Structure 1
Amino acid sequence: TDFYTIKDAQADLAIAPLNLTVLLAPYSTTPATTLESPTDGSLAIPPGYKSVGHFEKQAGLTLGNEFDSKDIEAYGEPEPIRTIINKRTTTFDFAMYQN
């Protein structure tokens, strides 16, 4: 098998978030299970979610994933036999313009 066939890379699977928006809702609002409209598969935002408007372009939106890990090493092994991801913290930050 040739290298290109082994790679089987698709450019269409690369998705560029050309226009991004952030919507916030009070904790009493029913959470959004999905954003796909059941009737026609369009973009359906549940009621109670309100956009934060424009935000900075150069800053963008940064999604941060932080892993807390623990190394399990055995008495009869030099390297750690296993690693445990105790927790995974998710954060996101951005710079809103509107008041």
Structure 2
Amino acid sequence: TDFYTIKDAQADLAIAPLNLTVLLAPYSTTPATTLESPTDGSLAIPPGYKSVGHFEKQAGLTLGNEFDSKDIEAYGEPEPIRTIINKRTTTFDFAMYQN
């Protein structure tokens, strides 16, 4: 098998978030299970979610994933036999313009 066939890379699977928006809702609002409209598969935002408007372009939106890990090493092994991801913290930050 040739290298290109082994790679089987698709450019269409690369998705560029050309226009991004952030919507916030009070904790009493029913959470959004999905954003796909059941009737026609369009973009359906549940009621109670309100956009934060424009935000900075150069800053963008940064999604941060933080892993807390623990190394399990055995008495008869030099390297750690296993690693445990105790927790995974998710954060996101951005710079809103509107008041």
Normalised TM-score (structure 2): 1.00
The ranges of structure 1 where at least 4 consecutive aligned residues each deviate by more than 6 angstroms after the TM superposition are: none
Q: Does 1:39 align with 2:74?
A: no
SS state at 1:84 partner: strand
SS at match of 2:19: coil
> What secondary structure sits across from 1:90 in the alignment?
strand
TM-score w.r.t. length of structure 1: 1.00
RMSD: 0.0
Q: Which residue of 2 aligns with 1:23?
A: 23
**1:37-90 alpha-carbon deviations (Å, 9 max, x no partner):** 000000000000000000000000000000000000000000000000000000
Aligned residues: 99
Identity of aligned residues (%): 100
For residues 10-47 of structure 1, the C-alpha deviation after alignment (integer angstroms, 9 at most, x for no partner) is: 00000000000000000000000000000000000000
Provide structure 2 residue ranges, at least 5 long, that are not aligned to the other structure: none
Give the deviation of 1:9 after TM superposition: 0.0
Give the corresponding residue for 1:70: 70
The gaps in structure 1 that reach 5 residues or longer are none
